[PDB]
PDB file of all heavy atoms in Angstrom:
ATOM      1  N   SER Z   1      -5.388   2.848   7.451  1.00  0.00           N
ATOM      2  CA  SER Z   1      -5.598   2.294   6.120  1.00  0.00           C
ATOM      3  C   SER Z   1      -5.710   0.770   6.109  1.00  0.00           C
ATOM      4  O   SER Z   1      -5.900   0.193   5.030  1.00  0.00           O
ATOM      5  CB  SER Z   1      -4.492   2.778   5.160  1.00  0.00           C
ATOM      6  OG  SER Z   1      -3.269   2.106   5.357  1.00  0.00           O
ATOM      7  N   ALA Z   2      -5.679   0.119   7.280  1.00  0.00           N
ATOM      8  CA  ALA Z   2      -5.751  -1.337   7.360  1.00  0.00           C
ATOM      9  C   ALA Z   2      -7.127  -1.903   7.018  1.00  0.00           C
ATOM     10  O   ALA Z   2      -7.235  -3.111   6.786  1.00  0.00           O
ATOM     11  CB  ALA Z   2      -5.333  -1.810   8.758  1.00  0.00           C
ATOM     12  N   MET Z   3      -8.179  -1.091   6.981  1.00  0.00           N
ATOM     13  CA  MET Z   3      -9.468  -1.626   6.541  1.00  0.00           C
ATOM     14  C   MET Z   3      -9.613  -1.658   5.027  1.00  0.00           C
ATOM     15  O   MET Z   3     -10.461  -2.394   4.516  1.00  0.00           O
ATOM     16  CB  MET Z   3     -10.617  -0.815   7.128  1.00  0.00           C
ATOM     17  CG  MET Z   3     -10.222   0.577   7.562  1.00  0.00           C
ATOM     18  SD  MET Z   3     -10.920   0.889   9.195  1.00  0.00           S
ATOM     19  CE  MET Z   3     -10.998  -0.793   9.871  1.00  0.00           C
ATOM     20  N   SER Z   4      -8.826  -0.868   4.302  1.00  0.00           N
ATOM     21  CA  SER Z   4      -8.804  -0.929   2.853  1.00  0.00           C
ATOM     22  C   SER Z   4      -7.610  -1.711   2.324  1.00  0.00           C
ATOM     23  O   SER Z   4      -7.370  -1.710   1.111  1.00  0.00           O
ATOM     24  CB  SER Z   4      -8.825   0.482   2.259  1.00  0.00           C
ATOM     25  OG  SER Z   4     -10.117   1.061   2.419  1.00  0.00           O
ATOM     26  N   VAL Z   5      -6.857  -2.377   3.198  1.00  0.00           N
ATOM     27  CA  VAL Z   5      -5.832  -3.287   2.714  1.00  0.00           C
ATOM     28  C   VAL Z   5      -6.474  -4.451   1.979  1.00  0.00           C
ATOM     29  O   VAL Z   5      -5.979  -4.890   0.935  1.00  0.00           O
ATOM     30  CB  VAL Z   5      -4.943  -3.765   3.872  1.00  0.00           C
ATOM     31  CG1 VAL Z   5      -4.046  -4.892   3.405  1.00  0.00           C
ATOM     32  CG2 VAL Z   5      -4.122  -2.606   4.387  1.00  0.00           C
ATOM     33  N   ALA Z   6      -7.610  -4.943   2.484  1.00  0.00           N
ATOM     34  CA  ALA Z   6      -8.253  -6.075   1.828  1.00  0.00           C
ATOM     35  C   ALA Z   6      -8.693  -5.716   0.410  1.00  0.00           C
ATOM     36  O   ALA Z   6      -8.594  -6.537  -0.507  1.00  0.00           O
ATOM     37  CB  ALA Z   6      -9.434  -6.566   2.661  1.00  0.00           C
ATOM     38  N   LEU Z   7      -9.164  -4.487   0.202  1.00  0.00           N
ATOM     39  CA  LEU Z   7      -9.528  -4.098  -1.155  1.00  0.00           C
ATOM     40  C   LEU Z   7      -8.280  -3.919  -2.008  1.00  0.00           C
ATOM     41  O   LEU Z   7      -8.253  -4.349  -3.165  1.00  0.00           O
ATOM     42  CB  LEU Z   7     -10.383  -2.825  -1.147  1.00  0.00           C
ATOM     43  CG  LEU Z   7     -10.585  -2.122  -2.498  1.00  0.00           C
ATOM     44  CD1 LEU Z   7     -11.329  -3.005  -3.508  1.00  0.00           C
ATOM     45  CD2 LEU Z   7     -11.320  -0.795  -2.308  1.00  0.00           C
ATOM     46  N   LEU Z   8      -7.227  -3.314  -1.447  1.00  0.00           N
ATOM     47  CA  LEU Z   8      -5.970  -3.173  -2.184  1.00  0.00           C
ATOM     48  C   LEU Z   8      -5.433  -4.531  -2.612  1.00  0.00           C
ATOM     49  O   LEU Z   8      -5.027  -4.717  -3.763  1.00  0.00           O
ATOM     50  CB  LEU Z   8      -4.926  -2.438  -1.329  1.00  0.00           C
ATOM     51  CG  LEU Z   8      -3.527  -2.351  -1.965  1.00  0.00           C
ATOM     52  CD1 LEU Z   8      -3.473  -1.341  -3.090  1.00  0.00           C
ATOM     53  CD2 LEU Z   8      -2.442  -2.068  -0.922  1.00  0.00           C
ATOM     54  N   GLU Z   9      -5.440  -5.501  -1.697  1.00  0.00           N
ATOM     55  CA  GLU Z   9      -4.939  -6.832  -2.016  1.00  0.00           C
ATOM     56  C   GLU Z   9      -5.789  -7.525  -3.078  1.00  0.00           C
ATOM     57  O   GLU Z   9      -5.249  -8.196  -3.967  1.00  0.00           O
ATOM     58  CB  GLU Z   9      -4.862  -7.677  -0.747  1.00  0.00           C
ATOM     59  CG  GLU Z   9      -3.587  -7.443   0.042  1.00  0.00           C
ATOM     60  CD  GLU Z   9      -2.321  -7.730  -0.787  1.00  0.00           C
ATOM     61  OE1 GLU Z   9      -2.291  -8.727  -1.562  1.00  0.00           O
ATOM     62  OE2 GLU Z   9      -1.360  -6.936  -0.675  1.00  0.00           O
ATOM     63  N   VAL Z  10      -7.117  -7.387  -3.007  1.00  0.00           N
ATOM     64  CA  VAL Z  10      -7.959  -7.961  -4.059  1.00  0.00           C
ATOM     65  C   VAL Z  10      -7.570  -7.389  -5.416  1.00  0.00           C
ATOM     66  O   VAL Z  10      -7.401  -8.126  -6.394  1.00  0.00           O
ATOM     67  CB  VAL Z  10      -9.450  -7.716  -3.767  1.00  0.00           C
ATOM     68  CG1 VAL Z  10     -10.260  -7.883  -5.056  1.00  0.00           C
ATOM     69  CG2 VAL Z  10      -9.943  -8.665  -2.697  1.00  0.00           C
ATOM     70  N   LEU Z  11      -7.397  -6.064  -5.495  1.00  0.00           N
ATOM     71  CA  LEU Z  11      -7.014  -5.462  -6.771  1.00  0.00           C
ATOM     72  C   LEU Z  11      -5.608  -5.880  -7.192  1.00  0.00           C
ATOM     73  O   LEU Z  11      -5.358  -6.108  -8.382  1.00  0.00           O
ATOM     74  CB  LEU Z  11      -7.107  -3.944  -6.693  1.00  0.00           C
ATOM     75  CG  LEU Z  11      -8.485  -3.411  -6.342  1.00  0.00           C
ATOM     76  CD1 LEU Z  11      -8.326  -1.976  -5.827  1.00  0.00           C
ATOM     77  CD2 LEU Z  11      -9.402  -3.492  -7.576  1.00  0.00           C
ATOM     78  N   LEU Z  12      -4.674  -5.982  -6.239  1.00  0.00           N
ATOM     79  CA  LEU Z  12      -3.319  -6.386  -6.596  1.00  0.00           C
ATOM     80  C   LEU Z  12      -3.286  -7.833  -7.085  1.00  0.00           C
ATOM     81  O   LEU Z  12      -2.596  -8.142  -8.059  1.00  0.00           O
ATOM     82  CB  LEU Z  12      -2.372  -6.188  -5.408  1.00  0.00           C
ATOM     83  CG  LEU Z  12      -2.028  -4.762  -4.942  1.00  0.00           C
ATOM     84  CD1 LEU Z  12      -1.221  -4.810  -3.650  1.00  0.00           C
ATOM     85  CD2 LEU Z  12      -1.253  -4.019  -5.978  1.00  0.00           C
ATOM     86  N   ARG Z  13      -4.035  -8.732  -6.441  1.00  0.00           N
ATOM     87  CA  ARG Z  13      -4.068 -10.124  -6.893  1.00  0.00           C
ATOM     88  C   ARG Z  13      -4.580 -10.240  -8.318  1.00  0.00           C
ATOM     89  O   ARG Z  13      -4.009 -10.973  -9.129  1.00  0.00           O
ATOM     90  CB  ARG Z  13      -4.944 -10.973  -5.976  1.00  0.00           C
ATOM     91  CG  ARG Z  13      -4.310 -11.310  -4.672  1.00  0.00           C
ATOM     92  CD  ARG Z  13      -5.207 -12.255  -3.936  1.00  0.00           C
ATOM     93  NE  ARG Z  13      -5.041 -12.107  -2.499  1.00  0.00           N
ATOM     94  CZ  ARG Z  13      -6.011 -11.735  -1.674  1.00  0.00           C
ATOM     95  NH1 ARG Z  13      -7.234 -11.482  -2.140  1.00  0.00           N
ATOM     96  NH2 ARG Z  13      -5.753 -11.627  -0.379  1.00  0.00           N
ATOM     97  N   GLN Z  14      -5.678  -9.546  -8.635  1.00  0.00           N
ATOM     98  CA  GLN Z  14      -6.267  -9.667  -9.969  1.00  0.00           C
ATOM     99  C   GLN Z  14      -5.294  -9.232 -11.054  1.00  0.00           C
ATOM    100  O   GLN Z  14      -5.392  -9.696 -12.194  1.00  0.00           O
ATOM    101  CB  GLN Z  14      -7.552  -8.841 -10.056  1.00  0.00           C
ATOM    102  CG  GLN Z  14      -8.646  -9.334  -9.141  1.00  0.00           C
ATOM    103  CD  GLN Z  14      -9.362 -10.546  -9.715  1.00  0.00           C
ATOM    104  OE1 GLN Z  14      -9.289 -10.813 -10.922  1.00  0.00           O
ATOM    105  NE2 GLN Z  14     -10.046 -11.287  -8.858  1.00  0.00           N
ATOM    106  N   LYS Z  15      -4.357  -8.341 -10.728  1.00  0.00           N
ATOM    107  CA  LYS Z  15      -3.285  -7.975 -11.641  1.00  0.00           C
ATOM    108  C   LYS Z  15      -2.054  -8.870 -11.497  1.00  0.00           C
ATOM    109  O   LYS Z  15      -1.074  -8.670 -12.216  1.00  0.00           O
ATOM    110  CB  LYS Z  15      -2.892  -6.508 -11.429  1.00  0.00           C
ATOM    111  CG  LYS Z  15      -4.013  -5.498 -11.740  1.00  0.00           C
ATOM    112  CD  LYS Z  15      -3.540  -4.062 -11.516  1.00  0.00           C
ATOM    113  CE  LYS Z  15      -4.696  -3.058 -11.392  1.00  0.00           C
ATOM    114  NZ  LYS Z  15      -5.497  -2.987 -12.635  1.00  0.00           N
ATOM    115  N   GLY Z  16      -2.080  -9.849 -10.599  1.00  0.00           N
ATOM    116  CA  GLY Z  16      -0.919 -10.687 -10.396  1.00  0.00           C
ATOM    117  C   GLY Z  16       0.249 -10.006  -9.717  1.00  0.00           C
ATOM    118  O   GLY Z  16       1.391 -10.440  -9.887  1.00  0.00           O
ATOM    119  N   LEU Z  17       0.001  -8.955  -8.941  1.00  0.00           N
ATOM    120  CA  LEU Z  17       1.053  -8.196  -8.283  1.00  0.00           C
ATOM    121  C   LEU Z  17       1.069  -8.513  -6.792  1.00  0.00           C
ATOM    122  O   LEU Z  17       0.029  -8.812  -6.197  1.00  0.00           O
ATOM    123  CB  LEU Z  17       0.851  -6.691  -8.496  1.00  0.00           C
ATOM    124  CG  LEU Z  17       0.639  -6.207  -9.931  1.00  0.00           C
ATOM    125  CD1 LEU Z  17       0.254  -4.731  -9.956  1.00  0.00           C
ATOM    126  CD2 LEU Z  17       1.886  -6.455 -10.761  1.00  0.00           C
ATOM    127  N   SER Z  18       2.257  -8.434  -6.180  1.00  0.00           N
ATOM    128  CA  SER Z  18       2.405  -8.664  -4.740  1.00  0.00           C
ATOM    129  C   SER Z  18       3.586  -7.867  -4.194  1.00  0.00           C
ATOM    130  O   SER Z  18       4.619  -8.427  -3.814  1.00  0.00           O
ATOM    131  CB  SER Z  18       2.567 -10.156  -4.448  1.00  0.00           C
ATOM    132  OG  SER Z  18       3.659 -10.694  -5.180  1.00  0.00           O
ATOM    133  N   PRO Z  19       3.456  -6.550  -4.112  1.00  0.00           N
ATOM    134  CA  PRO Z  19       4.468  -5.776  -3.392  1.00  0.00           C
ATOM    135  C   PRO Z  19       4.387  -6.078  -1.911  1.00  0.00           C
ATOM    136  O   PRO Z  19       3.351  -6.500  -1.394  1.00  0.00           O
ATOM    137  CB  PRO Z  19       4.085  -4.322  -3.680  1.00  0.00           C
ATOM    138  CG  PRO Z  19       2.588  -4.384  -3.878  1.00  0.00           C
ATOM    139  CD  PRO Z  19       2.364  -5.693  -4.619  1.00  0.00           C
ATOM    140  N   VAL Z  20       5.513  -5.869  -1.229  1.00  0.00           N
ATOM    141  CA  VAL Z  20       5.548  -5.938   0.226  1.00  0.00           C
ATOM    142  C   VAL Z  20       4.750  -4.775   0.807  1.00  0.00           C
ATOM    143  O   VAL Z  20       4.859  -3.633   0.339  1.00  0.00           O
ATOM    144  CB  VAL Z  20       7.011  -5.913   0.710  1.00  0.00           C
ATOM    145  CG1 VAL Z  20       7.097  -5.760   2.211  1.00  0.00           C
ATOM    146  CG2 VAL Z  20       7.737  -7.165   0.259  1.00  0.00           C
ATOM    147  N   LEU Z  21       3.932  -5.060   1.823  1.00  0.00           N
ATOM    148  CA  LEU Z  21       3.185  -4.038   2.545  1.00  0.00           C
ATOM    149  C   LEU Z  21       3.767  -3.873   3.942  1.00  0.00           C
ATOM    150  O   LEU Z  21       4.082  -4.859   4.610  1.00  0.00           O
ATOM    151  CB  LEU Z  21       1.692  -4.386   2.647  1.00  0.00           C
ATOM    152  CG  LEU Z  21       0.945  -4.834   1.389  1.00  0.00           C
ATOM    153  CD1 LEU Z  21      -0.530  -5.058   1.708  1.00  0.00           C
ATOM    154  CD2 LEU Z  21       1.118  -3.844   0.238  1.00  0.00           C
ATOM    155  N   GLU Z  22       3.915  -2.622   4.369  1.00  0.00           N
ATOM    156  CA  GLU Z  22       4.512  -2.272   5.647  1.00  0.00           C
ATOM    157  C   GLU Z  22       3.687  -1.188   6.312  1.00  0.00           C
ATOM    158  O   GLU Z  22       3.334  -0.190   5.675  1.00  0.00           O
ATOM    159  CB  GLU Z  22       5.934  -1.724   5.490  1.00  0.00           C
ATOM    160  CG  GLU Z  22       7.026  -2.743   5.401  1.00  0.00           C
ATOM    161  CD  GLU Z  22       8.385  -2.090   5.264  1.00  0.00           C
ATOM    162  OE1 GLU Z  22       8.658  -1.101   5.993  1.00  0.00           O
ATOM    163  OE2 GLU Z  22       9.169  -2.558   4.407  1.00  0.00           O
ATOM    164  N   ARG Z  23       3.441  -1.351   7.604  1.00  0.00           N
ATOM    165  CA  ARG Z  23       2.824  -0.278   8.368  1.00  0.00           C
ATOM    166  C   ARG Z  23       3.816   0.853   8.566  1.00  0.00           C
ATOM    167  O   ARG Z  23       4.984   0.627   8.893  1.00  0.00           O
ATOM    168  CB  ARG Z  23       2.307  -0.798   9.710  1.00  0.00           C
ATOM    169  CG  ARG Z  23       0.941  -1.460   9.562  1.00  0.00           C
ATOM    170  CD  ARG Z  23       0.643  -2.431  10.677  1.00  0.00           C
ATOM    171  NE  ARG Z  23      -0.605  -3.149  10.416  1.00  0.00           N
ATOM    172  CZ  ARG Z  23      -1.723  -2.988  11.119  1.00  0.00           C
ATOM    173  NH1 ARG Z  23      -1.749  -2.137  12.138  1.00  0.00           N
ATOM    174  NH2 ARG Z  23      -2.813  -3.689  10.811  1.00  0.00           N
ATOM    175  N   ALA Z  24       3.348   2.079   8.347  1.00  0.00           N
ATOM    176  CA  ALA Z  24       4.175   3.264   8.502  1.00  0.00           C
ATOM    177  C   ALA Z  24       3.306   4.415   8.995  1.00  0.00           C
ATOM    178  O   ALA Z  24       2.078   4.315   9.065  1.00  0.00           O
ATOM    179  CB  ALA Z  24       4.887   3.620   7.191  1.00  0.00           C
ATOM    180  N   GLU Z  25       3.962   5.509   9.365  1.00  0.00           N
ATOM    181  CA  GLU Z  25       3.297   6.726   9.819  1.00  0.00           C
ATOM    182  C   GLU Z  25       3.837   7.901   9.018  1.00  0.00           C
ATOM    183  O   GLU Z  25       5.058   8.045   8.871  1.00  0.00           O
ATOM    184  CB  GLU Z  25       3.522   6.953  11.323  1.00  0.00           C
ATOM    185  N   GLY Z  26       2.942   8.727   8.497  1.00  0.00           N
ATOM    186  CA  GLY Z  26       3.341   9.943   7.811  1.00  0.00           C
ATOM    187  C   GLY Z  26       2.395  10.251   6.670  1.00  0.00           C
ATOM    188  O   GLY Z  26       1.408   9.561   6.443  1.00  0.00           O
ATOM    189  N   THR Z  27       2.715  11.321   5.959  1.00  0.00           N
ATOM    190  CA  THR Z  27       1.948  11.680   4.777  1.00  0.00           C
ATOM    191  C   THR Z  27       2.482  10.925   3.562  1.00  0.00           C
ATOM    192  O   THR Z  27       3.592  10.387   3.574  1.00  0.00           O
ATOM    193  CB  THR Z  27       2.007  13.182   4.522  1.00  0.00           C
ATOM    194  OG1 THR Z  27       3.339  13.532   4.142  1.00  0.00           O
ATOM    195  CG2 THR Z  27       1.611  13.955   5.779  1.00  0.00           C
ATOM    196  N   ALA Z  28       1.670  10.884   2.504  1.00  0.00           N
ATOM    197  CA  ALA Z  28       2.083  10.166   1.307  1.00  0.00           C
ATOM    198  C   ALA Z  28       3.384  10.730   0.763  1.00  0.00           C
ATOM    199  O   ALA Z  28       4.320   9.978   0.455  1.00  0.00           O
ATOM    200  CB  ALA Z  28       0.982  10.219   0.244  1.00  0.00           C
ATOM    201  N   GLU Z  29       3.471  12.061   0.647  1.00  0.00           N
ATOM    202  CA  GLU Z  29       4.646  12.647   0.005  1.00  0.00           C
ATOM    203  C   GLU Z  29       5.910  12.429   0.833  1.00  0.00           C
ATOM    204  O   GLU Z  29       6.987  12.216   0.275  1.00  0.00           O
ATOM    205  CB  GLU Z  29       4.429  14.135  -0.265  1.00  0.00           C
ATOM    206  CG  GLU Z  29       3.634  14.410  -1.525  1.00  0.00           C
ATOM    207  CD  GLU Z  29       3.703  15.864  -1.961  1.00  0.00           C
ATOM    208  OE1 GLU Z  29       4.824  16.390  -2.137  1.00  0.00           O
ATOM    209  OE2 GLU Z  29       2.630  16.484  -2.128  1.00  0.00           O
ATOM    210  N   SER Z  30       5.807  12.471   2.159  1.00  0.00           N
ATOM    211  CA  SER Z  30       7.019  12.279   2.947  1.00  0.00           C
ATOM    212  C   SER Z  30       7.423  10.812   2.989  1.00  0.00           C
ATOM    213  O   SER Z  30       8.616  10.501   2.959  1.00  0.00           O
ATOM    214  CB  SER Z  30       6.835  12.832   4.360  1.00  0.00           C
ATOM    215  OG  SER Z  30       6.203  11.882   5.196  1.00  0.00           O
ATOM    216  N   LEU Z  31       6.443   9.898   3.039  1.00  0.00           N
ATOM    217  CA  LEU Z  31       6.752   8.472   2.983  1.00  0.00           C
ATOM    218  C   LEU Z  31       7.305   8.074   1.621  1.00  0.00           C
ATOM    219  O   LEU Z  31       8.140   7.168   1.539  1.00  0.00           O
ATOM    220  CB  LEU Z  31       5.511   7.638   3.320  1.00  0.00           C
ATOM    221  CG  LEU Z  31       5.122   7.676   4.794  1.00  0.00           C
ATOM    222  CD1 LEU Z  31       3.763   7.030   5.059  1.00  0.00           C
ATOM    223  CD2 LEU Z  31       6.222   6.992   5.596  1.00  0.00           C
ATOM    224  N   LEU Z  32       6.872   8.741   0.547  1.00  0.00           N
ATOM    225  CA  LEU Z  32       7.435   8.427  -0.760  1.00  0.00           C
ATOM    226  C   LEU Z  32       8.891   8.850  -0.862  1.00  0.00           C
ATOM    227  O   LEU Z  32       9.599   8.387  -1.764  1.00  0.00           O
ATOM    228  CB  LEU Z  32       6.607   9.075  -1.882  1.00  0.00           C
ATOM    229  CG  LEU Z  32       5.265   8.365  -2.159  1.00  0.00           C
ATOM    230  CD1 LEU Z  32       4.324   9.217  -3.013  1.00  0.00           C
ATOM    231  CD2 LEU Z  32       5.468   6.983  -2.798  1.00  0.00           C
ATOM    232  N   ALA Z  33       9.359   9.716   0.036  1.00  0.00           N
ATOM    233  CA  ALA Z  33      10.764  10.093   0.064  1.00  0.00           C
ATOM    234  C   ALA Z  33      11.486   9.481   1.257  1.00  0.00           C
ATOM    235  O   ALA Z  33      12.598   9.899   1.586  1.00  0.00           O
ATOM    236  CB  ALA Z  33      10.913  11.619   0.058  1.00  0.00           C
ATOM    237  N   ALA Z  34      10.872   8.494   1.913  1.00  0.00           N
ATOM    238  CA  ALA Z  34      11.454   7.801   3.059  1.00  0.00           C
ATOM    239  C   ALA Z  34      11.449   6.284   2.844  1.00  0.00           C
ATOM    240  O   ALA Z  34      11.292   5.506   3.801  1.00  0.00           O
ATOM    241  CB  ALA Z  34      10.721   8.178   4.352  1.00  0.00           C
ATOM    242  N   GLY Z  35      11.586   5.848   1.589  1.00  0.00           N
ATOM    243  CA  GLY Z  35      11.818   4.449   1.279  1.00  0.00           C
ATOM    244  C   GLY Z  35      10.658   3.634   0.715  1.00  0.00           C
ATOM    245  O   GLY Z  35      10.778   2.402   0.657  1.00  0.00           O
ATOM    246  N   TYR Z  36       9.554   4.267   0.295  1.00  0.00           N
ATOM    247  CA  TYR Z  36       8.423   3.562  -0.306  1.00  0.00           C
ATOM    248  C   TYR Z  36       8.153   4.072  -1.717  1.00  0.00           C
ATOM    249  O   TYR Z  36       8.322   5.264  -2.002  1.00  0.00           O
ATOM    250  CB  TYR Z  36       7.160   3.710   0.557  1.00  0.00           C
ATOM    251  CG  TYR Z  36       7.336   3.124   1.929  1.00  0.00           C
ATOM    252  CD1 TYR Z  36       7.683   3.930   3.005  1.00  0.00           C
ATOM    253  CD2 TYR Z  36       7.203   1.761   2.145  1.00  0.00           C
ATOM    254  CE1 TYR Z  36       7.869   3.395   4.270  1.00  0.00           C
ATOM    255  CE2 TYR Z  36       7.382   1.218   3.399  1.00  0.00           C
ATOM    256  CZ  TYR Z  36       7.719   2.035   4.458  1.00  0.00           C
ATOM    257  OH  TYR Z  36       7.890   1.502   5.714  1.00  0.00           O
ATOM    258  N   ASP Z  37       7.755   3.151  -2.604  1.00  0.00           N
ATOM    259  CA  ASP Z  37       7.237   3.486  -3.928  1.00  0.00           C
ATOM    260  C   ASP Z  37       5.740   3.755  -3.919  1.00  0.00           C
ATOM    261  O   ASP Z  37       5.219   4.354  -4.864  1.00  0.00           O
ATOM    262  CB  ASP Z  37       7.442   2.338  -4.932  1.00  0.00           C
ATOM    263  CG  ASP Z  37       8.772   1.673  -4.821  1.00  0.00           C
ATOM    264  OD1 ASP Z  37       9.807   2.387  -4.801  1.00  0.00           O
ATOM    265  OD2 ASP Z  37       8.778   0.419  -4.794  1.00  0.00           O
ATOM    266  N   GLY Z  38       5.036   3.252  -2.920  1.00  0.00           N
ATOM    267  CA  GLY Z  38       3.597   3.398  -2.863  1.00  0.00           C
ATOM    268  C   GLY Z  38       3.172   3.663  -1.440  1.00  0.00           C
ATOM    269  O   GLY Z  38       3.803   3.202  -0.482  1.00  0.00           O
ATOM    270  N   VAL Z  39       2.097   4.435  -1.308  1.00  0.00           N
ATOM    271  CA  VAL Z  39       1.536   4.774  -0.005  1.00  0.00           C
ATOM    272  C   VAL Z  39       0.023   4.698  -0.098  1.00  0.00           C
ATOM    273  O   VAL Z  39      -0.584   5.302  -0.989  1.00  0.00           O
ATOM    274  CB  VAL Z  39       1.968   6.176   0.483  1.00  0.00           C
ATOM    275  CG1 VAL Z  39       1.505   6.395   1.924  1.00  0.00           C
ATOM    276  CG2 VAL Z  39       3.486   6.335   0.398  1.00  0.00           C
ATOM    277  N   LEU Z  40      -0.584   3.959   0.820  1.00  0.00           N
ATOM    278  CA  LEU Z  40      -2.032   3.859   0.915  1.00  0.00           C
ATOM    279  C   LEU Z  40      -2.523   4.816   2.000  1.00  0.00           C
ATOM    280  O   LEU Z  40      -2.043   4.763   3.139  1.00  0.00           O
ATOM    281  CB  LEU Z  40      -2.453   2.418   1.220  1.00  0.00           C
ATOM    282  CG  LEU Z  40      -3.977   2.230   1.189  1.00  0.00           C
ATOM    283  CD1 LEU Z  40      -4.490   2.530  -0.215  1.00  0.00           C
ATOM    284  CD2 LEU Z  40      -4.397   0.844   1.655  1.00  0.00           C
ATOM    285  N   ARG Z  41      -3.455   5.702   1.639  1.00  0.00           N
ATOM    286  CA  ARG Z  41      -4.071   6.649   2.565  1.00  0.00           C
ATOM    287  C   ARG Z  41      -5.585   6.559   2.438  1.00  0.00           C
ATOM    288  O   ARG Z  41      -6.114   6.325   1.345  1.00  0.00           O
ATOM    289  CB  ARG Z  41      -3.648   8.100   2.285  1.00  0.00           C
ATOM    290  CG  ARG Z  41      -2.141   8.349   2.201  1.00  0.00           C
ATOM    291  CD  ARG Z  41      -1.567   8.480   3.584  1.00  0.00           C
ATOM    292  NE  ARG Z  41      -1.527   9.849   4.083  1.00  0.00           N
ATOM    293  CZ  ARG Z  41      -1.639  10.152   5.370  1.00  0.00           C
ATOM    294  NH1 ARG Z  41      -1.844   9.194   6.263  1.00  0.00           N
ATOM    295  NH2 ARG Z  41      -1.569  11.410   5.770  1.00  0.00           N
TER     296      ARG Z  41
END
């Protein structure tokens, strides 16, 4: 998902948002129950 990080960041900036981004491994649903509010896939 690192090639769409740049698009995610463009959209987050335009809304004035800046969550921390972390590289992780897993599915969205399991990562959402392993310490993340958001998952990019």
Side-chain angles (χ1 to χ4, degrees), residues 1-24 26-41:
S1 76
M3 21 226 28
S4 287
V5 170
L7 167 63
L8 175 74
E9 276 302 320
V10 161
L11 301 160
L12 291 173
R13 284 186 209 118
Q14 296 281 341
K15 297 180 198 297
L17 309 172
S18 56
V20 171
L21 312 183
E22 276 181 44
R23 278 158 186 249
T27 68
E29 278 194 55
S30 84
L31 287 171
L32 285 166
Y36 299 97
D37 319 310
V39 188
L40 186 63
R41 308 279 269 149

